[PDB]
Design a protein around this ligand. Structure first.
Ligand code: NI
Length: 341
């Protein structure tokens, strides 16, 4: 059954709760973003109302084939009424179309559900600042002090300079970027822009990108692999074997590959800075691991929560074991004692 952390008290709303069949009492199902864990169970067979961003609605329509009658897209930064209750969608700074939702309950309680998010100080000057938030449903993916990472902009700058140097040294080099869902598009778009190229990709991936309301998208991406010097492949192919195999397929138009694996955190965040990063190499193929995160670091999460000063926190990630919940509660109490709420 639907866990209490996916239910919004004193409404019949749920959030990211599609895998439990019909939820008893639920009149509106909210979807924060188009990642498979959150949408799990949604398909062309679903027949209840789904509320979401415009981008998330495009994806539901075109990729999952959910029938149009059941998709209720809402604009961002706008007070809207859903089944008699005031809501606002805010940018989550996660992947394209990802939202946080602000729910103003009839009794006067105010609840923020973050979805998946990367906390940022620009969120301190949104509609959130206008009133007290009593309850916070929090993306606790990286809720432990070891999880540090560079800014998105540091990582992109590194990627740009690396790619530009390699292709100026060898104009027959191909650049490959690995991918497994939506998110982290700035990695491949920024590399292509410094090389004066479009991004080449499969038909399924191109169809996904065509849903995302990216300005001038038709000038940036193509299904013609031949004509482009940046290619997208599934993350699972970003290894020496898969990359030599792809190089054989391109018809001797390239004689070297430079590949990037955008990952979350991995243990080598604890010593290395982005400027010290060096690739793994075997012959004419080099693979760079780059920690481009679309989740809050510990410090970013702590700052946001200390600013917001919620009366209660409801974790939404790593809640499956008592050890994790206990550890998280410890950090929430420290933050509260330091900040005086
Ligand atoms: Ni996500």
């Amino acid at each position: 059954t639907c866990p209490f952390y996916k239910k919004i008290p004193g409404t019949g709303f749920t959030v990211d709760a599609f895998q439990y069949g019909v939820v008893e009492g639920c009149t509106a199902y909210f979807l924060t973003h188009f990642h498979s864990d959150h949408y799990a169970g949604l398909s062309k067979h679903f027949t209840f109302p789904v509320y979401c961003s415009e981008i998330t609605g495009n994806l539901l329509k075109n990729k999952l084939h959910v029938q149009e009658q059941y998709i209720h897209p809402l604009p961002l930064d706008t007070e809207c009424i859903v089944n008699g209750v005031k809501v606002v969608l805010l940018d989550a700074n996660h992947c394209p179309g990802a939202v946080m939702i602000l729910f103003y309950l009839p009794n006067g309680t105010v609840i923020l559900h973050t979805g998946d998010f990367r906390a940022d100080p620009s969120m301190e000057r949104s509609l959130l600042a206008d009133q007290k938030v009593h309850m916070l449903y929090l993306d606790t993916t990286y809720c432990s002090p070891e999880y540090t990472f560079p800014s998105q902009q540091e990582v992109i700058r590194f990627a740009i300079n690396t790619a530009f140097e390699a292709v100026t040294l060898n104009p027959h080099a191909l650049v490959v970027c690995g991918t497994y869902s939506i998110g982290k598009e700035k990695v491949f778009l920024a590399i292509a822009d410094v090389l004066g190229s479009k991004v080449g990709m499969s038909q399924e991936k191109y169809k996904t990108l065509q849903c995302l309301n990216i300005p001038e998208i038709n000038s940036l991406i193509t299904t013609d692999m031949c004509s482009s010097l940046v290619h997208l492949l599934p993350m699972m192919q970003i290894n020496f074997k898969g990359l030599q195999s792809h190089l054989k397929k391109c018809g001797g138009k390239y004689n070297q590959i430079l590949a990037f694996r955008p990952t979350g955190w991995t243990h080598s965040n604890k010593f290395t800075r982005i400027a010290d990063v060096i690739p793994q190499t075997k012959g004419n193929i080099s693979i760079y691991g780059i920690p481009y995160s679309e989740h809050s670091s510990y410090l970013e999460m702590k700052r946001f929560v200390q600013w917001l000063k919620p009366q209660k926190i409801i974790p939404t990630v790593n809640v499956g074991t008592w050890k994790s919940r206990s550890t998280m509660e410890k950090y929430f109490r420290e933050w509260k004692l330091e900040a005086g709420y």
